[PDB]
Design a binder for these strands. Sequence first.
RNA 1: UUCACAUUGCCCAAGUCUU
RNA 2: CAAUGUGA
Length: 800
Amino acid sequence: AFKPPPRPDFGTSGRTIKLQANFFEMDIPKIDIYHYELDIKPEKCPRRVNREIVEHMVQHFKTQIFGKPVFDGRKNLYTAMPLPIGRDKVELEVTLPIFKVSIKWVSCVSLQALHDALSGRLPSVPFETIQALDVVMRHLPSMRYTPVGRSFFTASEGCSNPLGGGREVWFGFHQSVRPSLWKMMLNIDVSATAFYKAQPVIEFVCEVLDFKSIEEQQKPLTDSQRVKFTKEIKGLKVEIRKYRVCNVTRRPASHQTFPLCTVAQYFKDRHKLVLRYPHLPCLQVGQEQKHTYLPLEVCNIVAGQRCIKKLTDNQTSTMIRATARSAPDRQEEISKLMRSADFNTDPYVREFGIMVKDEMTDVTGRVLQPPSILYGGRNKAIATPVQGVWDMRNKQFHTGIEIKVWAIACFAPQRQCTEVHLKSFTEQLRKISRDTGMPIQGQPCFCKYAQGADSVEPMFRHLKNTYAGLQLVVVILPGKTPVYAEVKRVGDTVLGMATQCVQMKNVQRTTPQTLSNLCLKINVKLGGVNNILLPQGRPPVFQQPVIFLGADVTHPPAGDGKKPSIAAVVGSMDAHPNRYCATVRVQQHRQEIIQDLAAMVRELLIQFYKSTRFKPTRIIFYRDGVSEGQFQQVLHHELLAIREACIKLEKDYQPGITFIVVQKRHHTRLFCTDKNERVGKSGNIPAGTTVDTKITHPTEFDFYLCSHAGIQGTSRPSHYHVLWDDNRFSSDELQILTYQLCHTYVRCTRSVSIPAPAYYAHLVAFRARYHLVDKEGRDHQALAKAVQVHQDTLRTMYFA
RNA sequence: UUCACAUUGCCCAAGUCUU
RNA sequence: CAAUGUGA
Ligand SMILES: [Mg+2]
Ligand SMILES: [Mg+2]
Ligand SMILES: [Mg+2]
């Protein structure tokens, strides 16, 4: 239960399309290359500090040693020809404007054995060899540019992309080495992120405070100003000799004091310095408990410090405006980068005789046929998606819900959302509900204005007790408000009542499209079936009972230290497949492995049997958001968790488990080669484009599938990787199955970018995160209850 | 909080050392 | 899901 299956075959389905991928072929020599371990003392040093130490050491000891190594920034060094070593250590003493370095060889890396693994000759790809190659390609840019993850950022030359607040956009590129069916590939993609301007602190103060210039004013800052500035620069580094800021003094430099005495005076006396701006305070740097101080005038923000904090609304707006790029525009920016990059020239890439193609790799994809969507009513109409989109005009829900009892609760101000507005909104919504098959048969049995989160629970309690057979509460919200989270806390977890919130602006001015999409959510929440896949058009897997599981963990934002990660798992409850149920848990901070999966799957198998009266013969498990580096760890725990659930249920119940990891967030981009193939304004590849050759895995079962219409920017083709498959799918069937599952998403008449089960799992997790707002053993149980839905909500699609 | 797509935020990675 | 855009 620990090795992924081989690729069973290649797909044959769909018309072919010519594509270019942001992969660049690598020509690698077959040689033994020599790996050395390293030790640098002290070893609490930053990665970049260590690189310097090796850099000098290499030029200092050039005679009788090293007479062009690469270095991974910690303890691994690679050379193209052997050193004067053996397994003998060599204790070296290096100096840099006081370090000791150990160099003990470890092994030989065979680039020969890598040609084999890329062939059918060898079963496995040797990670240690791929690791080496990565260090080679990364060595130069890790010192020229500023690394962030697997990317590299630098201030663009001649361009300034200021964000305000003392920030600006830096442009960069992702870089990674990947084996493939064809060759080694250099994956390159352009990116941008926020950095702090290396301007004087004085100018940094200005932009943060919105001064046109300093001297406005020459009075000491208001505490409102001194605090806001404290928030911006604390934790940043500054140079005079670099230092990190840990505090901003309360008193001006003229009257701030320390035991050797005014800050102004020490610079006046010791350093011959009279300060232009005594009225302003001082940065406290170094150790918080020690008493070092610097005035702002003698300090610069040191370059290369990424902005870890969230951008403001306007900074975000600016950032997007800068990096927004249609697919051709994006294809051209990667291309220009690679020609410019001059990978071949790099002297370290040369030491290892590596050659990189300057042109994007050509790959042949296939564009799969969309499934037909069956509707109900008397029409029993069939929708046919064109380019990943269809519509509901002249169509009714497969199983529409008749709404007899419902209510409206308006938390928008009466002045702003009038009874006319609500009445007109009710008129149109009823018109669209009729055209849609989910007839709202009469006016609401209750319609009252309210205010504040305080009125929610009593209102909803009154409703539940007063109106028998109450199906729905429509809730009008003024905009962004804590009432929403409250409405859902009470509705989902406290009273178990269906609610549908609507922004006030979408009530004041309705449209047929918005109301149609709104009915999609309502009908589902009330137990309806919007549509189903054309039964006779489904893959053979449906000939027997099968459950489709979607799973996902959602972790806390950057910089957060204590919030839990939220695991969510959903399972199909019919043979369509359309109706899903959901389980959800809180678990350890930033743990990807779903800890309580067995319990979650058991719940779903039980409810599947209660809904369908079948026991699944197969389990198709779509698992979102696991990266290659976590495949084995995740699969081991979660495959065994699914078996565990099955085994503790009955007998020998051993359905076939297919384990698929879905990755939407990678750096593979696909482009149309021929301009006549590009779709829409964004110029993206068409919905259904499938790639399972050339750029994919050399031995294992994986494929790219872009299942959605690209509206804007460059589409992300979702990657699927089969980690386990008891059911022995062919490439065709699984690719078609995955694609058809993208058309079973109930919130829109579109093919979405990942399978509905996986998509729902996101919605579920995000809803759990909403139940926990401002609430995040005894700690665990408190949160565990916050995300536990009512008994009456368990079997619903409340998350729609 | 009508909805999708796109940018960022999420596991891996990255990150952390005389006033 | 939140912020920000493109769209229906
Ligand atoms: Mg995730
Ligand atoms: Mg780590
Ligand atoms: Mg949005």
